[PDB]
Symmetry: D2
């Protein structure tokens, strides 16, 4: 993990994220999207749980992106929860939650759920 | 938001989190849980999307907690996605995803989903 | 379960559902909503997993409602997954997924997630 | 939809489901799994929202499977929410919620979330 997580990742929809996995569980970087009310690079911050593993499991991690930068303010944020699997074809499999700020009446419809798989290629 | 988010929040299960909402969308603090393979305080990091609002909507935000500290290493991480609503009875309504590192065979059962509401009281 | 599930249930938003839990795991009834692109009663169908329990656990169950009836066709369907807990204050705690038919380009934003608690009162 | 939904579907993990989409929104059939505390065929019931479409969108639908049959009683149920897209490579893209009956103390960890894509091949 850590060294293996650090780098550029791409998902099926064309988004890209560059992350640095720091020694004490931190994940920092930028996300450049391909879809949504997004436009350019947004800051991302997260954490990963580093473990000695002896059975080939993935490294659990998660990060958040608030969709606001100097060109767009979508009033929403997305969090990705998943795990990193390294190797030949290292990947990060995730499920995400995208919440939009709504009025109380519409809060019941404020969150979308989806999944994304990121690869190094 | 920001000033209103900064502070101590409590949820229905007895967990507590203290956060500082920084001027440029950052959320940093600690989470002390009440349930799970948790024990003590864990670092939390996230982002919030600050907007001029003129219709009473909530502020979208999200944060991550990797469940590893000096006393526990649960090999998992949780991400909360939701929005802050301020006022008399300010609250943060969220939905969360908890992913555990698993082997490929068990990846299909690696993520739990739930929701939490935090209040200042 | 079964006998205890059969009846009228109400949730926090004002929706109501009447169900009959049949001897072999079937759930049939109608859902009358309070929110959404809904208007009147819709047919609901589902299943519940009946078990001999000796430790007070809930009965897992799930149902689906396609939001189409003689007055509305919202092009969407919602599924509720949860469990029934009986007793003095019997309740059905659920998490739901609402999917809308979209074009391929928008499929990534086709599903909303939420939770509902139903009571007999 | 309807005629196009009726038939045998397969997902990436080796599970199979045979469904009949009836004229008035009903979905009935059997699910034979490949993973979990499953073993053989289980009854499935659901609904789909049939619409006149003029822009190539998918048909929203959902179904439930209680994991109990004559050989297994897993005390759990899964609901799939998604949409059918027809054509050359017709598919049903879904997100699912699997809830297990738990005690109140463990209800917070009773639901798993995932996604599955089914094809006719």
């Amino acid at each position: 993990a850590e060294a293996g997580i650090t780098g550029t990742w791409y998902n099926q929809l064309g988004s890209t994220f560059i992350v640095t996995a720091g020694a004490d569980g931190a994940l920092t970087g930028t996300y450049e999207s391909a879809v949504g009310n997004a436009e350019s690079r947004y800051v991302l911050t997260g954490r990963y749980d580093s473990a000695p593993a002896t059975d080939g499991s993935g490294t659990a991690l998660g990060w958040t992106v608030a969709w606001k930068n100097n060109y767009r303010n979508a009033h929403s944020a997305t969090t990705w929860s998943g795990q990193y699997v390294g190797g030949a074809e290292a990947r990060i499999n995730t499920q995400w939650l995208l919440t939009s700020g709504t009025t109380e009446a519409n809060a019941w419809k404020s969150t979308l759920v989806g999944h994304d798989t990121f690869t190094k290629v």
